[PDB]
């Protein structure tokens, strides 16, 4: 008496996998609703039964429980109403601030923009970190992988970007505004709560959407969280608004997908990851794009995070994500405990976009900084006992240590592009060679204060003009020299 076309009966339920008999008209990847109320996603439309993953605990689901068709593929609330709200994978609010007023529901499986709609990424996405903004530039529309080991600073590198976006977002200028989305995959609720507290304290929540899929959340929710967040971000990109998404722990999403696939009996592969894990990550990161003017001119910057195990960048998921992304920001625990905080390894870190994603002033200083630092890396081995070396080698080592001290930036302290340009200008020109190594950071701070307060006009010139004109360079030279002469006390 059961139709078995729009309804079905669970033949077997276990380990989060329900083999439902019936549902002959179920679409692939269509969400279905169980009798207990838990939703499910139809993944394996096998001939005799449909294998649907359960979005909740399996104690509620039993054999024989009626499963009905919702009739639609998974879609999440998508809009500017989400801004400032913590939601789960399906978009339901979890911050207890009330229902989301979203008036649009976008499917999470929508394909990425094609070759024609996209355009070369040019607009600089200012992270606020001196090391990233100078030596590993990131542009709006670029997929940059914040790769590293555990407890290395991967999350910090991303949160300071969201905090840094406050400067532009509060400004009236709309082309520079960058709404942010943070997707927490696997992080515990305590960690997510601390992160949102930090953002609220920095008053960054107003332009941030925090999609969370914690460990307690069932594997399918963790699998769908990145796609939901990306779909939420696409709204801005498709409507001429610039957006940034941070898929923290994309590895954990791969783990959840592996759990789903293996329990669904999908054939295993290397490290038991299903063969389509590369496809799973690619159909997500490729949605990040810089659309052309005809398509709105919006951007969806992506900052995936992958946790390498003991620096194993040749593992399955690291290799896949590295291949997909347009560069990486490698962080090393050795540098983190060597005083280099942030722990960005300049050598391994690379940006395919390159200088095209940098302000002309930042280009001018950063090119010279890059050359000097590369030479320092070349001669870094001698440094240990390089006192008896050629004067050129000594000069290289001194300039390198000065620049390395310059690159160090305190946590939760995003700097403006003009201030970064001023500090890098101080370093590359060679005004800090005489200064003692430990004094370099103290000078950085004092000079930052001096230029920000006394000489805000010059910072405005760098900010507005966007390049170090000859007059600015002369004025910058005078300011730096004058302060440097009086800095030491």
């Amino acid at each position: 008496s059961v139709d078995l076309e729009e309804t079905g009966r669970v033949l077997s339920i276990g380990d989060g996998i329900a083999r439902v008999h019936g549902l002959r008209n179920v679409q692939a990847e269509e969400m279905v609703e169980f009798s207990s109320g838990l939703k499910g996603m139809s993944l394996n439309l096998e001939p005799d039964n449909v294998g649907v993953v359960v979005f909740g605990n399996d104690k509620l689901i039993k054999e024989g429980d009626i499963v009905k068709r919702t009739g639609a593929i998974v879609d999440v609330p998508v809009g500017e109403e989400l801004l400032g709200r913590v939601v789960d994978a399906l978009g339901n609010a979890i911050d207890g601030k009330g229902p989301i007023g979203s008036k649009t529901r976008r499917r999470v499986g929508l394909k990425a923009p094609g070759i024609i709609p996209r355009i070369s990424v040019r607009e600089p996405m200012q992270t606020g970190i001196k090391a990233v903004d100078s030596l590993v530039p990131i542009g709006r529309g670029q997929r940059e992988l914040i790769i590293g080991d555990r407890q290395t600073g991967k999350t910090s590198i991303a949160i300071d970007t969201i905090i840094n976006q406050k400067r532009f977002n509060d400004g009236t200028d709309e082309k520079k505004k960058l709404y942010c989305i943070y997707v927490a995959i696997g992080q515990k609720r305590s960690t997510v709560a601390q992160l949102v507290k930090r953002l609220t304290d920095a008053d960054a929540m107003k332009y941030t959407i925090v999609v969370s899929a914690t460990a307690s959340d069932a594997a399918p929710l963790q699998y769908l969280a990145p796609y939901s967040g990306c779909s939420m971000g696409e709204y801005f990109r498709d409507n001429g608004k610039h957006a940034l998404i941070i898929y923290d722990d994309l590895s954990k999403q791969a783990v959840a997908y592996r759990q789903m696939s293996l329990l669904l009996r999908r054939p295993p592969g290397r490290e038991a990851y299903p063969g389509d894990v590369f496809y799973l990550h690619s159909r997500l990161l490729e949605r990040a794009a810089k659309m052309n003017d005809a398509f709105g001119g919006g951007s969806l910057t992506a900052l995936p995070v992958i946790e390498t195990q003991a620096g194993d960048v040749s593992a399955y998921i690291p290799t896949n994500v590295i291949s997909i992304t347009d560069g990486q920001i490698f962080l090393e625990t050795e540098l983190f405990y060597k005083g280099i905080r942030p722990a960005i390894n300049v050598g391994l870190s690379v940006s395919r976009v390159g200088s095209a994603a940098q302000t002309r002033a930042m280009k001018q200083v950063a090119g010279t900084m890059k050359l000097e630092l590369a030479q320092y890396r070349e001669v870094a081995a001698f440094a240990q006992f390089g006192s008896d070396l050629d004067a050129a080698t000594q000069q290289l080592l001194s300039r390198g240590v000065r620049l390395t001290e310059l690159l160090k930036q305190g946590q939760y302290a995003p700097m403006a592009i003009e201030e970064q340009v001023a500090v890098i200008y101080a370093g590359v020109r060679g005004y800090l060679d005489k200064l003692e190594p430990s004094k370099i950071t103290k000078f950085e701070n004092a000079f930052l204060s001096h230029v920000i307060s006394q000489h805000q006009a010059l910072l405005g010139k760098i900010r507005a003009d966007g390049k170090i004109s000859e007059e600015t360079d002369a004025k910058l030279k005078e300011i730096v020299t004058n302060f440097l002469a009086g800095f030491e006390a």
């Binding site: 669970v10 033949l11 077997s12 339920i13 276990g14 380990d15 989060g16 083999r19 605990n57 399996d58 104690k59 039993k62 054999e63 024989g64 913590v86 979890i94 911050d95 207890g96 555990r150 407890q151 696997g186 515990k188 609720r189 305590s190 960690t191 997510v192 709560a193 601390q194 507290k197 969370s212 914690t214 460990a215 307690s216 069932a218 594997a219 722990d249 954990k252 783990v255 959840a256 592996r258 759990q259 293996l262 329990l263 009996r265 295993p268 490290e271 038991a272 990851y273 195990q309 003991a310 194993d312 625990t333 050795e334 405990y337 060597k338 005083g339 240990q384 006992f385 006192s387 946590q411």
Partner: protein, 470 residues
């Protein structure tokens, strides 16, 4: 209640067929006819009204067709103030031979995790008294502490020392969950707390409850004892608005036990060999062990690192679930420094100059940096020779060695092992001493003076004794 019959007994996985309504997953099934109590927890609805169940005790003696009843609830344990001073099993049975645990409230081991809006955002500091922990990786009140380590590195000794220093002082009750550990250690802990006074067999002032499932227990039992212990802790958190201390030994056993039964449950092996439901099950357990807005649970979990490989999936996943991590390195223990905390691997979320203070943060980072530079210098030493390094290099090496020695702290629980009396160093004294050593005020003192001491006052005093005996 829908009396089922055993249809298959393979290992610990027992399949029961229910003619009447099938028991929902995670419910407890009682096997009738056995002299003792054997509880089968439903794992999968295989089909044809048959449930695949993992036994919570030995499966020997089971005969196909034996009647199995349905309790109708997940495994329920006696819980309340009456569990203090009592040892209970996974199925909540008194194993201390002190009579039944007469609690008026029963709670199921399986329960939902606390919600996001129930998470607390405060971060205090818990001064254990250990120089390495308090300085480098300070523990937090209510945070989840993790004692990562291999075999024979100091996890059990460290956790017992933490119990002695913190739990005894802490007014709130504590719970010890002996998941997959040596039975001898369980008896040692039980007797030690009896004489220490934490457990009073005469009065009702006991402050620590004991849940033990040792490695002698079957794989199924070793996978739920942690859940039983955390359920007791949750009662001491929600029903009673008190601060609790959950001490679990070798949580790794929780994950390992699942790996011993996943193949029989019918799951394709995941990488290395763990169950495909590793992270999900570990999170389901760990998310429950948190400090809600109702109450606080400072949890210290020992995590065995298989073959001293931190990249192993079991320890790797647990890293994300712990606020403060202390990794015990075997190489340091081989050097003799006890505790063997790895100074350059241990991390804590409260290690923030805003939280611990600027001086504390600066001193800790300086210690870590000087030890990193020493690690760098050792490679040079191996080729050049110690009598070839620069004076700055020699000074750095000497100071780093002094700091490493001063990290070692004699423990009261380790008085039996080392022979030295246990010492507890206040946080202020730890910071002051390490700051002085970094400055170089004690460069004239020999390195030996800084080994197995308490405060730097003990450090300098020891040097004088050696000079008197020189």
């Amino acid at each position: 209640a829908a009396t089922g019959r055993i249809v298959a007994v393979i290992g610990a996985v027992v399949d029961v067929q229910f003619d009447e309504g099938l028991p929902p997953i995670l419910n407890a099934l009682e096997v009738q006819g056995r002299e003792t109590r054997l509880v089968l927890e439903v794992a999968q609805h295989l089909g044809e009204s048959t449930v695949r169940t993992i036994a919570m005790d030995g499966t020997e003696g089971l005969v196909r067709g034996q009647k199995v009843l349905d309790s109708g609830a997940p495994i329920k344990i006696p819980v309340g103030p009456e569990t203090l001073g009592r040892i209970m099993n996974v199925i909540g049975e008194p194993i201390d031979e002190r009579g039944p645990i007469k609690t008026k409230q029963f709670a199921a081991i399986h329960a939902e995790a606390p919600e996001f809006m129930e998470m607390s955002v405060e971060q205090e500091i818990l001064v254990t008294g250990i120089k390495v922990v308090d300085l480098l990786a300070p523990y937090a009140k209510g945070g989840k502490i993790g004692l990562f380590g291999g075999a024979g590195v100091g996890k059990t000794v460290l956790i017992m020392e933490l119990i002695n220093n913190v739990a005894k002082a802490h007014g709130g009750y504590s719970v010890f969950a002996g998941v997959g550990e040596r039975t001898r250690e369980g008896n040692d802990l039980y007797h030690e707390m009896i004489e220490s006074g934490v457990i009073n067999l005469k009065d009702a002032t006991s402050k620590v409850a004991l849940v033990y499932g040792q490695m002698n227990e079957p794989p199924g039992a070793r996978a739920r004892v942690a859940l039983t212990g955390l359920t007791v802790a949750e009662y001491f958190r929600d029903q009673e608005g008190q601060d609790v201390l959950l001490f679990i030994d070798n949580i790794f056993r929780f994950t390992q036990a699942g790996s011993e039964v996943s193949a029989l449950l019918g799951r394709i092996p995941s990488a290395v060999g763990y169950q495909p439901t590793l992270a999900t099950d570990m999170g389901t357990m760990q998310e429950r062990i948190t400090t809600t807005k109702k109450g606080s649970i400072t949890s210290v979990q020992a995590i065995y690192v298989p073959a001293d490989d931190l990249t192993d999936p079991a320890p790797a996943t647990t890293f994300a679930h712990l606020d403060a991590t202390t990794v015990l390195s075997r190489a340091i223990a081989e050097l003799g420094i006890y505790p063997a905390v790895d100074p350059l691997d241990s991390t804590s979320r409260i290690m923030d100059p805003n939280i611990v203070g600027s001086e504390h943060y600066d001193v800790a980072r300086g210690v870590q940096k000087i030890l990193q530079d020493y690690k760098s210098l050792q490679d040079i030493i191996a080729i050049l020779g110690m009598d070839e390094l620069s004076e700055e290099d020699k000074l750095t090496v000497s100071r780093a060695r002094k700091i490493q020695r001063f990290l070692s702290q004699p423990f009261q629980v380790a008085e039996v092992f080392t022979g030295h009396l246990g010492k507890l160093v206040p946080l202020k004294e730890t910071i002051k001493g390490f700051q002085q050593i970094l400055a170089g005020e004690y460069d004239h003192l020999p390195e030996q003076a800084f080994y197995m001491v308490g405060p730097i006052e003990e450090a300098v005093a020891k040097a004088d004794k050696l000079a008197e005996e020189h």
